[PDB]
Amino acid sequence: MIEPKEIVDPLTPDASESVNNILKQSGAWSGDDKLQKWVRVYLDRG
Amino acid sequence: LWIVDLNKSDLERLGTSWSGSITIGDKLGVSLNQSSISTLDGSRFIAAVNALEEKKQATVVSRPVLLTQENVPAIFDNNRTFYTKLIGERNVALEHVTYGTMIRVLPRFSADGQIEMSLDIEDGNDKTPQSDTTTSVDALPEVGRTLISTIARVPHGKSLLVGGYTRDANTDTVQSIPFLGKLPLIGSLFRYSSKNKSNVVRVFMIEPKEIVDPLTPDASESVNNILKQSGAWSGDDKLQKWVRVYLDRG
Amino acid sequence: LEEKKQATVVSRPVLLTQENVPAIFDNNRTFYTKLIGERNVALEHVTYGTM
Amino acid sequence: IRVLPRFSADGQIEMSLDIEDGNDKTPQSDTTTSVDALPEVGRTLISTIARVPHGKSLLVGGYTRDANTDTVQSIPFLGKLPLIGSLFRYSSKNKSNVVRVF
Amino acid sequence: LWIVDLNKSDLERLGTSWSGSITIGDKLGVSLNQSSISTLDGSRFIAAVNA
C-alpha cells in the first residue's frame, strides 16, 4: 500500500523529552553519575 | 541526530513428536515416520519432547554531534567494537560486534531563522554470521544497516523526523497426530505448538541548533575534575611536573 | 502427521523529502531464533531487506 | 591531526581540522581479563573548519551511547509455582553506557 | 585538542537450563530438549547453572 501526507510542523513534544522518558523507564539513564556528568553537561544545553 | 532502537520478542515451544518402529515374530515390521528397518530390528519406538520459552527486550540509543560553518561540508564517522564476556577463561573464546556510523552534511541559513541541511547518514553492524551460543547473540543486540539521502529543513532549535522503520510479526503452528490428537483425556500429549512474536521500531531523528558562544566552564576545568576523581591525576609527581608545566599555561 | 501453519508480518518504512528532489531509504536486519540446545550448538537466521 | 590556522581581526582563531583516533580492529585478547586490561576506543574521523575566540575552548564533535538487555528464559509449566519455581529461571541483564567527545 | 573517553558496563547472569532423557523398560524413551536417544540409552538427565 501507499499513503503520503503533508507535514509543516515540528514534533510535539520535543525529542529531548522523548528519549528522557525512554532512558528513565527502560533503565539506562545516565545523568545520576557524578563521574560522567562533567562532560555530558557540555552536550545537552549548548 | 538521534538513533533509537526498540526490540521486543517472545517465543514458546511445547509438545512432542514421535518416531520409531516395532516388530512381530520376524514376519512383519511396522515403522512410524521414516524409521528404516534396514538400520534397526529390535530398537523400539521413542519420543522427543521440547519445552523452552523466553522473553527478550533490548534498547540502544546513540547520537553523534558535529558543527560546521554555513555552506561548507563536513564528515563524521565512527565504529567501535563491543566485546562481551563469554563464560570461561581457560576454555577460551570471544565474540564481538562492530558498530559503525557515518554522517555528512552541508548546512545553510534561511531568512526567517530556519536551518536547511543535506543528509546522508548510515548506521549499523556488518552482517556477521557469529555468536553461535544461545546467549551470545542475546548479549549484544543487532541493528540493521540503513542509508538516507535527503535534504530537509527545520525551524530553529526544534526537532524533526527524518526516517524510520517499524515491523510486527507472529507465527503459529500446531503439529499433531491425526487420529489420536483429539480425544479429551490425553489427546493434548500429542501436540507440538510453537508460537513466536517480535515487534521492532527504529527511527532517525534530527535537530540542529545555532551556537555562538564558547564553552562555560572552560575545558581545562572539565578534565581536571575528571582526572582528580577518576583517579588518574598526574600533577603531584615531582619527576614529571618539570615538563608538564611548559605545557599547561604557555 | 498433520499440522496447521499461520503467520503474519506487517512492516512499514517512513521517510520525507522536499518536492522535486530524490531520496533513498534501504534497510536489512537479520532476525535470529533460538534453536534448541546450547552445547549441541547451531543457529539459523534470515536477512530481511527493504529498499 | 592536520591543521591550517589563521588570525581574524577581533582576535579569534579559525582552523581547519581533520583528526583521527583509535585502534585498528583486532580480533584478539582471548582471555576474559585480557580485553579488560586495555580498553578499546573506536576509530573516528572529522573534517571541519571551526573558529573560536582567543584562549577559550570549543567542542568539535562527539558520540554517546546507552543500552540495556533483559531476558528471562524458563520452563513453561513449572516456572511459576511459588515454592521452587524460581529454580528454573535463567535471567541475564546487561547494561553499558559510553561517552566520547573531541 | 582533548580526546576523552568514559566507559561503564555491568552484566549479570543467573539461572539454570536443563536437558537429558530417561527410559522405561526398553519400551519407551522420553527426552528433554533435543537429546537424541541414538547417542544415549541410560545416561540420565542433567542440568547446568551459570552464576
XYZ file of C-alpha atoms in Angstrom:
500
model
C 0.000 0.000 0.000
C 0.976 3.656 -0.029
C -0.126 6.914 1.608
C 1.680 10.256 1.775
C 0.914 13.172 3.997
C 1.915 16.818 4.092
C 3.941 17.994 7.092
C 4.702 21.562 8.200
C 5.206 21.336 11.873
C 7.969 20.375 14.297
C 7.465 17.402 16.584
C 5.274 17.874 19.643
C 6.508 17.178 22.280
C 10.222 17.704 21.798
C 12.690 14.890 21.150
C 14.765 15.595 24.252
C 11.676 14.751 26.309
C 11.062 11.574 24.311
C 14.378 9.858 24.971
C 14.458 11.081 28.561
C 11.216 9.209 29.031
C 12.821 6.183 27.387
C 16.044 6.115 29.359
C 14.445 6.646 32.769
C 11.978 3.804 32.217
C 13.958 1.287 30.197
C 16.580 1.509 32.932
C 19.579 3.070 31.185
C 19.500 6.681 32.379
C 22.980 8.074 32.846
C 22.667 11.506 34.415
C 22.924 10.403 38.024
C 26.628 9.581 37.727
C 28.939 12.072 39.381
C 31.855 10.878 37.243
C 30.331 11.319 33.802
C 28.077 14.367 34.204
C 31.099 16.680 33.917
C 31.214 16.081 30.160
C 27.591 15.334 29.274
C 26.612 18.771 30.575
C 28.637 20.417 27.786
C 26.450 18.492 25.417
C 22.785 18.772 26.400
C 22.018 22.509 26.558
C 24.781 24.099 24.462
C 20.732 13.396 15.160
C 19.218 10.674 17.330
C 19.445 6.984 16.569
C 16.953 4.990 18.614
C 16.094 1.292 18.663
C 13.490 -0.774 20.445
C 13.394 -4.551 20.196
C 10.978 -6.970 21.830
C 10.360 -10.640 21.202
C 8.932 -13.668 22.922
C 8.784 -17.273 21.853
C 7.406 -20.501 23.259
C 7.848 -24.141 22.274
C 5.968 -27.087 23.729
C 4.901 -30.561 22.666
C 6.199 -33.900 21.493
C 6.998 -35.629 18.216
C 7.245 -39.385 17.876
C 9.130 -41.911 15.759
C 10.401 -45.485 15.795
C 9.276 -48.990 14.917
C 8.162 -52.371 16.266
C 8.381 -55.970 15.067
C 6.191 -59.091 15.173
C 7.725 -62.573 15.104
C 10.301 -61.788 12.355
C 7.370 -61.839 9.932
C 6.237 -58.229 9.790
C 7.696 -54.850 10.663
C 5.679 -51.708 11.375
C 7.523 -48.409 11.377
C 6.411 -44.918 12.326
C 7.702 -41.855 10.500
C 10.501 -42.887 8.114
C 12.334 -45.166 10.571
C 14.061 -47.619 8.235
C 14.133 -51.256 9.384
C 17.437 -51.606 7.449
C 19.154 -49.903 10.434
C 17.055 -51.266 13.334
C 15.358 -54.560 14.214
C 14.658 -54.512 17.954
C 15.098 -50.850 18.871
C 11.587 -49.909 19.939
C 9.877 -46.602 19.283
C 10.990 -43.434 21.056
C 9.716 -39.902 21.655
C 11.114 -36.390 21.993
C 9.596 -33.526 23.970
C 10.689 -29.899 23.787
C 9.936 -27.250 26.373
C 11.513 -23.794 26.391
C 10.272 -20.237 26.280
C 11.707 -16.763 26.729
C 11.114 -13.013 26.568
C 13.783 -10.785 25.008
C 13.937 -6.987 25.180
C 16.725 -4.595 24.234
C 17.192 -0.881 23.622
C 20.057 1.176 22.211
C 20.146 4.971 21.808
C 23.116 6.719 20.232
C 23.794 10.199 18.959
C 26.553 11.924 17.015
C 27.242 15.634 17.315
C 29.263 17.863 14.988
C 29.400 21.505 13.875
C 30.483 23.413 10.754
C 30.163 26.847 9.266
C 27.418 27.504 6.772
C 27.872 26.417 3.116
C 30.761 24.073 3.929
C 30.734 20.260 4.048
C 31.804 18.062 6.940
C 32.142 14.341 7.600
C 31.771 12.338 10.795
C 32.166 8.585 11.034
C 32.792 6.163 13.858
C 32.945 2.473 14.615
C 33.604 0.912 17.995
C 33.816 -2.811 18.641
C 31.873 -4.024 21.666
C 33.121 -7.170 23.359
C 31.279 -9.347 25.843
C 32.445 -11.909 28.353
C 31.823 -15.441 27.223
C 31.811 -17.741 30.233
C 35.235 -19.346 30.599
C 38.886 -18.269 30.777
C 40.878 -21.434 30.016
C 38.005 -22.800 27.931
C 38.597 -19.669 25.956
C 36.585 -17.858 23.249
C 35.309 -14.377 22.387
C 32.585 -12.762 20.313
C 32.341 -9.195 19.156
C 30.269 -6.798 17.068
C 31.438 -3.645 15.298
C 29.046 -0.683 15.380
C 29.525 1.744 12.500
C 28.102 5.227 11.956
C 28.611 7.833 9.209
C 27.127 11.276 8.508
C 27.959 14.049 6.057
C 26.110 17.362 5.853
C 26.012 20.758 4.137
C 24.001 23.383 6.049
C 22.859 26.925 5.341
C 20.744 29.634 6.953
C 17.376 30.898 5.779
C 15.849 34.348 6.129
C 13.236 33.646 8.800
C 15.629 31.703 11.022
C 15.304 28.066 9.999
C 18.144 25.713 9.035
C 18.286 23.623 5.872
C 20.703 20.718 5.640
C 21.687 17.903 3.284
C 21.841 14.468 4.822
C 23.493 11.176 4.015
C 23.630 9.022 7.145
C 24.447 5.380 7.864
C 24.273 3.154 10.934
C 24.573 -0.496 11.858
C 26.790 -3.527 12.029
C 28.156 -5.513 9.124
C 26.410 -8.835 8.507
C 28.391 -11.349 10.556
C 27.397 -14.997 10.979
C 28.638 -15.477 14.531
C 27.747 -15.655 18.250
C 26.914 -19.330 17.983
C 25.824 -19.918 21.570
C 22.277 -19.034 22.636
C 23.029 -16.062 24.867
C 25.961 -14.890 22.734
C 23.552 -13.281 20.285
C 21.498 -12.189 23.302
C 24.408 -10.252 24.811
C 24.810 -7.629 22.094
C 21.686 -6.628 20.158
C 21.780 -6.259 16.409
C 20.643 -3.242 14.403
C 20.468 -3.396 10.635
C 22.205 -1.205 8.129
C 20.412 1.893 6.917
C 21.001 4.707 4.474
C 19.232 8.020 3.836
C 19.816 10.655 1.158
C 17.708 13.673 1.985
C 17.684 17.439 2.118
C 15.384 18.619 4.903
C 14.787 21.962 6.622
C 13.574 22.582 10.151
C 12.786 25.641 12.308
C 15.303 26.904 14.814
C 16.108 24.803 17.856
C 13.333 22.230 17.400
C 13.316 18.653 16.229
C 12.058 16.981 13.067
C 11.952 13.331 11.994
C 13.969 12.137 9.024
C 13.089 8.479 8.556
C 12.372 5.220 10.256
C 11.225 1.630 10.127
C 8.797 -0.498 12.123
C 7.850 -4.170 11.946
C 5.354 -6.532 13.598
C 5.127 -10.308 13.217
C 3.553 -13.513 14.516
C 3.851 -17.238 13.846
C 1.602 -20.080 14.949
C 1.715 -23.812 14.340
C 0.055 -26.868 15.872
C 1.755 -30.105 14.814
C -0.010 -33.259 15.935
C -1.065 -36.856 15.181
C -4.297 -37.144 13.127
C -6.435 -39.704 14.945
C -5.135 -39.603 18.493
C -4.737 -35.858 18.876
C -8.392 -35.067 19.568
C -9.528 -37.405 22.356
C -10.258 -35.396 25.515
C -8.221 -37.263 28.098
C -4.590 -37.384 26.924
C -5.055 -36.033 23.408
C -3.033 -32.937 24.242
C 0.017 -35.088 24.932
C 0.497 -35.475 21.165
C 0.574 -31.788 20.243
C 3.537 -29.680 19.244
C 2.797 -25.964 19.498
C 5.300 -23.168 18.953
C 4.217 -19.549 18.843
C 6.571 -16.686 18.018
C 6.184 -12.935 18.145
C 8.513 -9.992 17.662
C 7.957 -6.287 17.114
C 10.631 -3.686 16.468
C 10.763 0.048 15.769
C 13.744 2.160 14.799
C 13.723 5.792 13.696
C 16.269 8.506 12.894
C 15.585 11.957 14.310
C 17.352 15.254 13.738
C 17.673 18.650 15.434
C 20.186 21.431 14.796
C 20.925 24.399 16.959
C 22.751 27.677 16.495
C 25.874 28.248 18.596
C 27.797 31.490 19.171
C 29.412 31.068 22.488
C 32.500 29.399 23.942
C 32.073 26.597 26.452
C 31.195 27.537 30.019
C 33.022 26.499 32.153
C 36.381 26.094 30.460
C 37.738 22.768 29.227
C 40.824 22.867 31.437
C 38.478 22.776 34.433
C 36.491 19.895 32.947
C 39.319 17.394 32.602
C 40.871 18.483 35.889
C 37.614 17.468 37.501
C 37.806 14.173 35.619
C 41.379 13.261 36.440
C 41.172 14.104 40.144
C 38.050 11.979 40.601
C 38.583 9.090 38.210
C 41.932 8.594 39.929
C 44.471 9.395 37.210
C 45.666 12.886 38.136
C 49.333 13.357 37.362
C 50.395 16.726 38.727
C 51.551 15.518 42.121
C 54.634 13.805 40.692
C 57.890 15.607 41.347
C 59.558 13.769 38.460
C 57.142 14.649 35.677
C 55.954 18.153 36.595
C 59.178 19.644 35.200
C 57.899 19.114 31.654
C 54.121 19.313 32.038
C 54.489 22.858 33.368
C 55.815 24.006 29.975
C 52.573 22.735 28.570
C 49.620 23.900 30.667
C 49.876 27.706 30.829
C 52.092 28.601 27.856
C 1.277 -36.360 10.814
C -0.707 -33.209 10.226
C -0.409 -29.527 11.050
C -1.831 -26.031 10.623
C 0.554 -23.128 9.982
C -0.308 -19.424 10.116
C 1.948 -16.375 10.091
C 1.648 -12.627 9.590
C 4.207 -9.853 9.158
C 3.472 -6.132 8.726
C 6.259 -3.621 8.181
C 6.423 -0.008 7.129
C 9.141 2.452 6.167
C 8.748 6.192 6.598
C 10.791 8.986 5.022
C 10.369 12.616 3.940
C 11.894 14.921 1.309
C 11.228 18.261 -0.272
C 9.368 18.390 -3.545
C 11.238 17.678 -6.825
C 14.194 16.056 -5.055
C 15.081 12.351 -4.872
C 15.669 10.301 -1.743
C 16.691 6.738 -0.930
C 15.816 4.507 2.005
C 17.033 0.954 2.441
C 17.293 -1.418 5.363
C 18.107 -5.001 6.205
C 18.002 -6.565 9.647
C 18.914 -10.159 10.405
C 16.463 -11.993 12.646
C 17.837 -14.845 14.719
C 15.893 -17.555 16.505
C 16.782 -19.911 19.312
C 17.461 -23.409 18.115
C 17.048 -25.829 21.000
C 20.455 -26.577 22.507
C 23.460 -24.662 23.856
C 26.312 -27.197 23.859
C 24.707 -29.083 20.974
C 25.108 -25.785 19.239
C 23.697 -24.348 15.983
C 21.945 -21.232 14.675
C 19.729 -20.197 11.785
C 18.991 -16.730 10.538
C 17.180 -14.778 7.835
C 18.036 -11.332 6.483
C 15.087 -9.048 5.710
C 15.852 -6.401 3.098
C 13.863 -3.338 2.042
C 14.568 -0.521 -0.438
C 45.784 15.624 13.084
C 46.422 18.148 10.326
C 45.511 21.831 10.531
C 45.707 25.181 8.732
C 45.182 28.186 11.030
C 44.805 31.920 10.513
C 44.107 35.043 12.556
C 40.975 37.166 12.476
C 40.577 40.883 13.089
C 38.918 40.815 16.510
C 41.343 38.263 17.940
C 39.786 34.861 17.313
C 41.450 31.878 15.620
C 39.994 29.905 12.725
C 41.378 26.479 11.896
C 40.774 23.566 9.531
C 40.560 20.170 11.147
C 40.959 16.584 10.052
C 41.585 14.389 13.093
C 41.645 10.644 13.732
C 41.950 8.460 16.822
C 41.609 4.835 17.826
C 42.914 1.330 17.451
C 42.683 -0.868 14.389
C 40.051 -3.606 14.593
C 41.899 -6.600 16.031
C 40.217 -9.876 16.987
C 42.408 -10.751 19.957
C 42.796 -10.787 23.765
C 41.022 -14.113 24.019
C 41.080 -14.490 27.795
C 38.439 -12.744 29.910
C 40.617 -10.127 31.578
C 42.864 -9.701 28.529
C 40.264 -7.460 26.911
C 39.682 -5.950 30.361
C 43.319 -4.873 30.704
C 43.439 -2.375 27.844
C 40.209 -0.551 26.984
C 39.136 -0.121 23.397
C 38.196 3.138 21.689
C 36.740 3.131 18.207
C 38.034 4.859 15.135
C 36.784 8.346 14.387
C 37.215 10.973 11.713
C 36.232 14.647 11.484
C 36.535 17.108 8.601
C 35.659 20.546 9.882
C 36.632 24.184 9.777
C 35.772 25.849 13.083
C 36.648 29.188 14.688
C 36.880 30.011 18.372
C 37.658 33.114 20.471
C 41.100 33.617 21.924
C 42.316 31.302 24.658
C 38.993 29.548 25.304
C 37.684 26.129 24.433
C 35.063 24.922 21.973
C 33.687 21.452 21.228
C 34.224 19.853 17.843
C 32.345 16.560 17.922
C 31.439 13.557 19.966
C 29.446 10.391 20.449
C 27.370 8.916 23.263
C 25.523 5.620 23.639
C 23.212 3.945 26.166
C 21.923 0.368 26.120
C 20.118 -2.352 28.065
C 19.224 -6.009 27.571
C 16.831 -8.198 29.530
C 15.788 -11.815 29.156
C 14.021 -14.374 31.339
C 14.393 -17.914 29.987
C 12.367 -20.530 31.824
C 10.249 -23.710 31.688
C 6.555 -23.098 30.833
C 4.573 -25.062 33.411
C 6.965 -25.392 36.321
C 8.400 -21.889 36.314
C 5.511 -20.195 38.118
C 4.820 -22.230 41.266
C 5.720 -20.181 44.356
C 7.960 -22.578 46.237
C 10.835 -23.606 43.945
C 9.580 -22.092 40.699
C 12.477 -19.648 40.626
C 14.934 -22.533 40.408
C 14.014 -22.935 36.725
C 14.708 -19.370 35.597
C 17.597 -18.078 33.548
C 17.950 -14.305 33.797
C 20.747 -12.241 32.283
C 20.639 -8.463 32.307
C 23.226 -6.288 30.573
C 23.866 -2.569 30.583
C 26.562 -0.320 29.176
C 26.811 3.416 28.609
C 29.681 5.251 26.956
C 30.511 8.839 26.016
C 33.427 10.130 23.988
C 33.959 13.672 22.727
C 36.688 15.653 20.963
C 42.733 19.158 21.321
C 41.395 16.867 24.035
C 40.415 13.265 23.477
C 38.332 11.934 26.349
C 36.632 8.584 26.913
C 34.341 7.219 29.578
C 33.216 3.604 29.615
C 30.956 1.853 32.102
C 29.257 -1.513 31.945
C 27.770 -4.111 34.227
C 26.369 -7.525 33.496
C 24.770 -10.321 35.480
C 23.923 -13.925 34.637
C 21.959 -16.320 36.812
C 19.756 -19.369 36.381
C 19.699 -22.900 35.060
C 18.894 -24.694 31.819
C 18.056 -28.374 31.655
C 18.423 -31.247 29.200
C 18.686 -35.028 29.042
C 16.486 -38.099 28.808
C 15.071 -41.108 30.659
C 13.960 -44.611 29.684
C 11.218 -47.058 30.702
C 11.708 -50.816 30.354
C 13.328 -50.654 26.867
C 9.845 -49.883 25.550
C 9.680 -46.101 25.559
C 12.150 -43.239 25.690
C 11.350 -39.700 26.824
C 13.860 -36.992 26.011
C 14.049 -33.358 27.050
C 15.384 -30.689 24.710
C 16.869 -32.350 21.607
C 18.778 -35.087 23.465
C 18.948 -37.845 20.852
C 18.477 -41.404 22.141
C 20.744 -42.549 19.252
C 23.729 -41.425 21.393
C 22.448 -42.272 24.902
C 20.367 -45.035 26.498
C 20.992 -44.902 30.249
C 22.623 -41.504 30.736
C 20.030 -39.713 32.838
C 19.094 -36.061 32.573
C 21.496 -33.335 33.676
C 21.430 -29.611 34.436
C 23.701 -26.591 34.072
C 23.706 -23.482 36.253
C 25.554 -20.260 35.492
C 26.403 -17.573 38.010
